[PDB]
Design a protein around this ligand. Structure first.
Ligand code: 9EO
Length: 293
């Protein structure tokens, strides 16, 4: 199909009109591999929103742009960032989202040590979201610290659904090479049909982020990191001797090469490691000060 055909199809899927009719003060605040995010203000109320802008021409696989705007429309969950509206503006898809004033987990893991009360809190929030999404056949496919956002009071919400997918009884597995190389599950890199289990592996890589500060193989070329994830034993914590046996045991249920033996989100919510999870207040110090690893 041509670019004009794709644009016309996406136009039928999004909300009509131009959101510049009610938004002001577009300022870029961050980016992903598929586009940028701006803060903006609703002109009549002063409400702050985040606007993701993705150029229809600059996508590796532009049909992925259908997925979030359809799958996640009207989705409501305590631990999921809200999508308000979506629009076509020129050759860009704009998705108007909830603004999460605490920013991304990435800026925490690069600036401070996290204790296990805080790591368990983050894991519990993400698994509460994933258990509900996976039960509806939604695979996130891009779990990583960049995808976890915080409120100023320390609540945790999952974002970055641009790569998500839908499985069903009729189409129970995906086969697309989708995600971020260092976090990708080995069966996904292997081009095997896969399901929600890939999110659990990615969550395990994010635990390594929270313990060590970076995922495995992070200054390796991405194609080389992907080969090592596919071919090597599951990656290991740099700070292995610093974590509790409970954390190690939890991680050992995530970084399981065989997806059939990997724990599910619902199974993980029962794990004793998550009994350590602190309340939102336990997370707030991570946004206000830095403590070295
Ligand atoms: O308030 C915020 N509400 C959101 C709603 C959704 C997303 C999101 O999906 N971002 C991914 C990258 O993670 C993405 C961006 C562009 C194209 C494709 C994916 C981000 C935010 C969001 C962000 C933000 C923006 C860019 C990168 C990381 C965090 C934010 N930073 C500081 C305070 N708040």
């Amino acid at each position: 199909s041509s670019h004009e055909q794709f644009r016309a199809a996406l136009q039928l899927v999004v909300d009509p009109g131009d959101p510049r009719s009610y938004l002001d003060n577009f300022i870029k605040i961050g980016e992903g591999s598929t586009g940028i995010v701006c803060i903006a203000t609703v002109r009549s109320s002063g409400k702050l929103v985040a606007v993701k802008k993705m150029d229809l021409r600059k996508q590796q696989r532009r049909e992925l742009l259908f997925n979030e705007v359809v799958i996640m429309r009207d989705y409501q969950h305590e631990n999921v960032v809200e999508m308000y509206n979506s629009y076509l503006v020129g050759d860009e898809l704009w998705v108007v989202m909830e603004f999460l004033e605490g920013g991304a987990l990435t800026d925490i893991v690069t600036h401070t040590r996290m204790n296990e009360e805080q790591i368990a809190a983050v894991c519990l929030a993400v698994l509460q979201a994933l258990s509900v999404l996976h039960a509806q056949g939604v695979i996130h496919r891009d779990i990583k610290s960049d995808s976890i956002l915080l409120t100023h009071d320390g609540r945790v919400k999952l974002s970055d659904f641009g790569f998500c997918a839908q499985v069903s009884k009729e189409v129970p597995r995906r086969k697309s090479l989708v995600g971020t190389p260092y976090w990708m599950a080995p069966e996904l890199i292997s081009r095997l049909p896969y399901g929600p289990e890939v999110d659990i592996w990615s969550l395990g890589i994010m635990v390594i982020e929270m313990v060590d500060g970076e995922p495995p193989y992070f200054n390796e070329p991405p194609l080389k990191a992907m080969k090592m994830i596919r071919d090597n034993l599951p990656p290991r914590l740099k700070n292995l001797h610093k974590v509790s046996p409970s954390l190690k045991g939890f991680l050992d249920r995530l970084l399981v090469r065989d997806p059939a033996q990997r724990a599910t989100a619902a199974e993980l919510l029962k794990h004793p490691f998550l009994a350590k999870a602190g309340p939102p207040a336990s997370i707030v110090p991570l946004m206000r000060q830095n403590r070295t690893r």
